[PDB]
Amino acid sequence: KEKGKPLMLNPRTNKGMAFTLQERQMLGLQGLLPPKIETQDIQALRFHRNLKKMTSPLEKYIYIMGIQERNEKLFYRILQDDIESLMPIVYTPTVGLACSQYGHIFRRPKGLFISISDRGHVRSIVDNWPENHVKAVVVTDGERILGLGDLGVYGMGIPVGKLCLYTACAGIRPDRCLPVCIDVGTDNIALLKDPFYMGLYQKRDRTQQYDDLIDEFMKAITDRYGRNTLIQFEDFGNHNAFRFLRKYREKYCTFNDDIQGTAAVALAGLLAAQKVISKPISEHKILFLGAGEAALGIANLIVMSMVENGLSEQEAQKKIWMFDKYGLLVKGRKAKIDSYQEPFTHSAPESIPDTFEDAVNILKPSTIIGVAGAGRLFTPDVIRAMASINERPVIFALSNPTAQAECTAEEAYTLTEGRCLFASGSPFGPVKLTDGRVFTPGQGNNVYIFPGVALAVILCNTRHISDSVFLEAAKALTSQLTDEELAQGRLYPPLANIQEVSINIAIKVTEYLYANKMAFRYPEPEDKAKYVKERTWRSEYDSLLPDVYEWP
Amino acid sequence: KEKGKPLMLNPRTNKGMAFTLQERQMLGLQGLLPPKIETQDIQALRFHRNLKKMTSPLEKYIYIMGIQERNEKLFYRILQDDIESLMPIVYTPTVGLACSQYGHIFRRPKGLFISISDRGHVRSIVDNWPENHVKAVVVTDGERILGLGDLGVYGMGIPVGKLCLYTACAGIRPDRCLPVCIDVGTDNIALLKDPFYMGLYQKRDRTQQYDDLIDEFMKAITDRYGRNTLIQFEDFGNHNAFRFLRKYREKYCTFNDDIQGTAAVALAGLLAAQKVISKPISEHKILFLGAGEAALGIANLIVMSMVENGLSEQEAQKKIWMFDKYGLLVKGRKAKIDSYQEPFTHSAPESIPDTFEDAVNILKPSTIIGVAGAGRLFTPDVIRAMASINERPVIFALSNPTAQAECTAEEAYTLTEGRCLFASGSPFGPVKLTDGRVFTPGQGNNVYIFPGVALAVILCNTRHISDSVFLEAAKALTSQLTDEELAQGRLYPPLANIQEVSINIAIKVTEYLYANKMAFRYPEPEDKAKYVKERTWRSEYDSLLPDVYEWP
Amino acid sequence: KEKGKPLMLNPRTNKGMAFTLQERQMLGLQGLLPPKIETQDIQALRFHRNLKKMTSPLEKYIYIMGIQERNEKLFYRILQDDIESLMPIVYTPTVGLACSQYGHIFRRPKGLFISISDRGHVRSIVDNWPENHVKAVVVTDGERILGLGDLGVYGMGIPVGKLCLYTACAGIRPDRCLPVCIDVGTDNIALLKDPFYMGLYQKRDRTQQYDDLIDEFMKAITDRYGRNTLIQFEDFGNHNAFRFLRKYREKYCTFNDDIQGTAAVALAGLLAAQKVISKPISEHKILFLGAGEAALGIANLIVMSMVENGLSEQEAQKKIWMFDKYGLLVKGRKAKIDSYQEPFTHSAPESIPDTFEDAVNILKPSTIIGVAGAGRLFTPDVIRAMASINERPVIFALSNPTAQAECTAEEAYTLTEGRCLFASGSPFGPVKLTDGRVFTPGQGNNVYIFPGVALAVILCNTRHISDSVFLEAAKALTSQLTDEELAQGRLYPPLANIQEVSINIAIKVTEYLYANKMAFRYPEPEDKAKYVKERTWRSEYDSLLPDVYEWP
Lengths: 552, 552, 552
Ligand SMILES: Nc1ncnc2c1ncn2[C@@H]1O[C@H](COP(=O)(O)OP(=O)(O)OP(=O)(O)O)[C@@H](O)[C@H]1O
Ligand SMILES: Nc1ncnc2c1ncn2[C@@H]1O[C@H](COP(=O)(O)OP(=O)(O)OP(=O)(O)O)[C@@H](O)[C@H]1O
Ligand SMILES: Nc1ncnc2c1ncn2[C@@H]1O[C@H](COP(=O)(O)OP(=O)(O)OP(=O)(O)O)[C@@H](O)[C@H]1O
Ligand SMILES: Nc1ncnc2c1ncn2[C@@H]1O[C@H](COP(=O)(O)OP(=O)(O)OP(=O)(O)O)[C@@H](O)[C@H]1O
Ligand SMILES: Nc1ncnc2c1ncn2[C@@H]1O[C@H](COP(=O)(O)OP(=O)(O)OP(=O)(O)O)[C@@H](O)[C@H]1O
Ligand SMILES: Nc1ncnc2c1ncn2[C@@H]1O[C@H](COP(=O)(O)OP(=O)(O)OP(=O)(O)O)[C@@H](O)[C@H]1O
Ligand SMILES: O=C(O)/C=C/C(=O)O
Ligand SMILES: O=C(O)/C=C/C(=O)O
Ligand SMILES: O=C(O)/C=C/C(=O)O
Ligand SMILES: O=C(O)/C=C/C(=O)O
Ligand SMILES: [Mn+2]
Ligand SMILES: [Mn+2]
Ligand SMILES: [Mn+2]
What we know:
The structure is cut from a larger assembly and holds 3 copies of chain A (552 residues).
Chain A lengths: L5 H4 L11 H6 L13 H14 L3 H12 L3 H10 L1 H8 L3 H7 L1 H4 L6 E4 L6 H5 L9 E5 L16 H14 L6 E7 L24 H18 L4 E4 L4 H11 L5 E3 H21 L8 E4 L3 H15 L5 H5 L2 E5 L2 E2 L27 H8 L3 E4 L9 H10 L4 E4 L11 H7 L5 E4 L6 E2 L5 E2 L2 E2 L6 H10 L7 H12 L4 H5 L10 H18 L12 H7 L18
Parallel strand pairs in A: 1-3, 2-3, 2-4, 4-5, 6-7, 6-9, 9-10, 10-11, 11-14
Antiparallel strand pairs in A: 7-8, 12-13
Helix pairs in contact in A: 3-5, 4-5, 10-19, 13-14, 13-20, 16-17, 19-22, 20-22, 22-23
The structure holds adenosine-5'-triphosphate (6 copies), fumaric acid (4 copies) and manganese (II) ion (MN) (3 copies).
């Protein structure tokens, strides 16, 4: 709708020297750009050339995330060129590093910021966002950033990172994505004394005003963009996460990535592992390190899988144990146990375990899943214990970023002598044992799930997301694992093919949504695969020339 | 999103001197307006003062229609002050006069113009319309403008007038209405030699390209604004009208005002008359003057009403006869008889009537409906014949504008000595007979129907409009007629109450759409009346002040 | 700059159907305009066709002034088609009728409004004017609108009308003109009780705050647009008029149209008259009816002319007598005599005249100039006296509008039996005496002067305007009168050629400014005629196409 300099200041439209000569002359850009007409290919080459000379990951993050604020098309072409090598820079673990330093590297803001001080005026803030057709929102309050804790407004880096993957992985239109940070204070003492902090200088408001603010936010967002606007909750504290999920899942189109997204990718990993172990469903014993968002989400999904495979909900729940910061969850312990943990809180065993290692030796689980976000809790002894108890132990260290991981791939594969099936939330390179064998660990991170599910739900005009949708996504993800890849130690499809893998999950989920009368997009497409592929946003430059033609 | 002079140049936001002091200072308008702060009441007074001094209707039309291009809010405020006295100026009959001279009084364009020369680039035309969220489109090709014939692009005045009533009558938001004119040429020889003509100087293109163009238009409109965008076809030629309705009613949210809207108001009138005559359903005999869009639409709607009241479709259709420009529609006549007319084409009677008067004296109908758009065909003899055959004859002269009317109120009431029940498409004032009795004729014009139906369909996110919707609208209109008003000779609710009547029809229709699973707006409101009334656009000025508040 | 709808909403850019196909497609207007591509000629025809059907002058004024708010280019094309017939509608007398009813016919505001309530914030008001390169300002406080009196903010019509002539007559760019109204209240009791009044409801502020405001205005205007911005004072009360001229003429580029502009046109008329009377400079006796802005302005210019032709300043002033509302101006009268009148206030004659007729018989003047703004004071007896005293009496009735004129053309020509040389401020058509002789009276209105002077001053970058500039404009106007036109009774060039006349005056004035080291535009052009003609704004449409071209 506008010509001249503004077309170059808006990263959404700016093509740099790729604007053709005719576009420049017709749009008032001639003279404002160097004479040279470039191609996106030359621009990509300039980027990779500069990236090569850079040393630190944070330096690289600043550079490429900056490109998103300069030339959006080029930004995604850059990710698309090699998503695997750029993932650790734009996503975990470096995104965690960027958040902890957000106030120090700040240059331009990204996303919508809503604070408790704006209560009563949230709608006018939403009306300030430039884009008029938002379809996907990723929101956080920064209380549980990865396993890093409370980073307040510095946590806005997470939503922006997630939304980049929406587009890079599933082809969801960037102009229809909206990262949101809800600022109600922070209990991080270091930030409250940091002069570069970008949020309110107050402790977190935990009164009803907090709930009222979230309510106002959900209403404002949907009032402007539609009741079926996808709203993904990310990195909210344990308490708030479940209650907001329960409270809104039936009234809005929403899901929690740390409860349901992580649950689905974990399940996909276990299904892949079972494909190589073939353990009798009755001999499965799962022990969780932690009992929060991820543990409960994963546990509930594992149970649904066992139920649709014979076992009763009750018998399935008995195969799952949890161990949190206070110890094993057993009936009558002094430490609390909420409604969600009840189903997995069993009667105290022969002896009560003091450490996690004791829990492993006493319960003798076949699977160990780390989701405590508290560092190396899967000690060498915990790993050796699992190797002596099981022929093929399954060890999952899902906490992010790297430093918070329960253990590394190198430790898991070595201490088990290449007999375990390992998956981690953050990346670890291939591991070569002294005997020459090479193991390539998979990354059990929800990035394999949310892009594809988000794409399907949006295309199908789904109103509410049921848990079964994530079970279906879990299956669609694992069903893409080729046997040759399992052999190498991969419990998930190669990260290099995350684009195709995400589109395939969306296709499967879209078919599931229509089959179960959960899709409201009319008419129903006959071929779901063609339907999804035709609607994916591409990073190639579009022509900005007005339609000129002679009249007959 | 903009300030300064532009706020005054856009009729949508321009308040004139009604901009408060704070708005002017905060939006950069101080000094661009006189110091005086006015109210809308004062602005309305200025208008009525000036209107009073004007003489000709066309002069008045140019003035008030011009206000819509200067101050939209004030425009509707003015219509709302006295819709009854302004209706004949902004709508029939004057709008017909305006179209005839459109090129002579042209000042500023309104609506979108799509020509056959634009085939292949229609989407680019649709992208030029400034509004982003259109919900209703009224389109014409100007081939059958009222009973005036082919006026080509001069016919754009009709869609503009219709959309004014959408808002003034049913409170549909103006910024969500789009008047469109499809220009593929004109057969009007006078216009092709007129130097002020606003369209292509060529005969009408009646080849497949025309159909292709309309196809491209329907697709471009829905691609930008949504598949459930209400598309009202207005004043298309007979052949094109039915085939476009049949072709699109199942694939788009569309209806034809001349076939379905007129059918509904006509039926509402008959239902009211029956309430005064109480004639045995078996003794009903309806004779149509004309057998096109209106005749066929009305006939089909009368048949549905009879079937839902006992009679079978077969026997109901036998009570309906039609007489067109070639004479009585009888089986085997030399003049064509298409698919739609077949059900009402009977076996030749005892003697074949030559004139309409012969048809009346031979068939002895109890009801006569004029929809020939060809002038005074209901001659004094025709009327006298009806008064001698029926105690209380029903005479409807629905052709517009006034000069095309089959007869006047004065003629109908006088020649039947006040025994008839009369309704006309164009307005006629009260009639006083030599014996002192005063008769107030009703106006059977679709304006009583499309505003209310359009509102309901838009609010309910209806995907397709069935004919039963118009049957329900017909019933909702007639159920608002108070017995006291029927006595006056009113077959329709007072035009002065058009606003309230349209909202009531909308409520009834929305209740019908939900009850028959035709509404897709979720969640379903419990109280449909409160649902409709809360969403009607109002002509009162809104505050344009930015949201300023302190941070606690 | 802009693209799309905005181009059509701004009268400056809007071309209506004259936008070419390429222009529409490249500027995003395709579909927003009827398919027809028109020329300005066709638009001009539409206008004249509509104007013919109209009856009253006020109705015509509203219509054409409304065009300035829709299509500026077309507006001036229309004036140019026939400036002589539209002059009385856009200018005197109709413009006076319009201002007296400005609040009743208001539709859109024009110009900048500065009120006493904005004292201290005048600059921010000036910063709200959209145009960035203003070169001419016409300002009024509405206290002396024509001979109509105090009309307050209703007087804005005058600065708007004057600027129209800046462009229509001298080709001064419209976007570089700014009409301004200074509102400090009004003493007009009728307006203070009018609900449609557009100004502050308070009597005029005659305190130092008024002077402050005017001073703040001059500084604000010059600060944003430049010290050489031409500021034309128009219709200020007698007291303020002189004091502001004297106070600012040496610090800013300013002049008063009622004092200096009127003076130059009157002088030009006298010079023409002398060309047909050849009366010995010694026997010249001028009697003024009134002794304010115009009389003092004219008197001083006449004096300069006589001095430059022999007579000393002292003896030239002796040939000038003035008669105001209290009687003849004689030394020692009870009525005040200010500094400006002193030079023309002589010793009481043998008998002190009581009426103007008595003043004529006693002083026996050869020239009579009416500038009292008080109606028909040149009674039949006054005129008869002049014809009896002189063979070829010179009678000037310069007050406006028509009703305030001292006498009509018909009155002057008949009562003097065609022997007088007449000129009036308002227009009067040809007069035919009973003997068959036809006399065409000239219009001594400053419109023959300010357009040309204004153009010259602007083009020359003149800093201050001396009284001698007006003397040269007076000579420049008169030197264009052909002998044949003198014969007809014309003291001024035909109004129909006002465009060429203004351009010629501008050329003579720029040559004068350069010759007298008053022009600062560098370099100095060698051919002033080519310099002026090349820079006049034209009403023909310009191409809005972006520069598109192929590269080698
Ligand atoms: N690439 C995309 N990224 C985000 N949302 C998308 C994307 N592609 C399509 N959609 C959304 O998915 C929904 C269904 O898509 P579809 O194209 O069938 O609908 P549409 O109404 O024709 O499109 P639109 O409303 O965008 O013009 C729409 O609401 C649309 O906004
Ligand atoms: N040192 C620890 N040893 C065992 N369990 C711990 C330890 N520290 C914390 N935990 C447990 O880890 C769980 C964290 O749950 P929470 O909902 O906060 O996050 P999460 O999303 O499940 O974890 P992740 O960091 O893997 O995303 C809690 O149940 C907590 O008791
Ligand atoms: N006054 C109106 N005129 C025209 N369309 C309307 C009007 N009011 C509401 N609508 C439309 O009716 C439909 C249902 O109304 P509702 O208010 O329930 O929807 P919404 O999604 O909350 O609104 P919106 O999409 O406008 O923000 C919407 O598509 C809306 O655009
Ligand atoms: N002079 C006539 N006498 C009888 N019938 C006529 C006469 N002239 C035209 N007709 C008929 O009137 C009908 C007009 O139908 P068409 O579809 O063109 O318009 P309509 O919308 O039905 O009429 P209206 O002008 O009332 O809106 C045709 O069937 C035509 O044969
Ligand atoms: N009734 C009257 N008879 C004679 N002189 C009058 C009469 N009424 C007013 N005057 C004089 O006319 C003069 C008006 O001067 P003022 O400065 O107000 O306006 P102006 O610009 O000179 O006049 P014009 O109306 O021609 O533009 C005053 O000198 C005043 O005394
Ligand atoms: N047609 C016009 N109407 C009003 N002002 C004009 C017009 N034409 C030229 N001017 C002004 O007259 C002055 C001298 O004219 P000239 O064209 O020599 O100047 P310039 O500095 O080259 O032009 P500019 O500053 O407009 O780019 C300038 O200040 C210019 O703004
Ligand atoms: O190569 C380019 O045109 C852009 C580079 C950047 O934004 O860093
Ligand atoms: O543009 C930058 O690098 C920083 C801006 C800021 O500190 O606000
Ligand atoms: O009264 C007003 O402010 C506007 C009047 C108009 O646009 O005609
Ligand atoms: O003829 C035109 O295009 C414009 C006419 C007007 O603005 O009145
Ligand atoms: Mn997370
Ligand atoms: Mn119609
Ligand atoms: Mn004046």
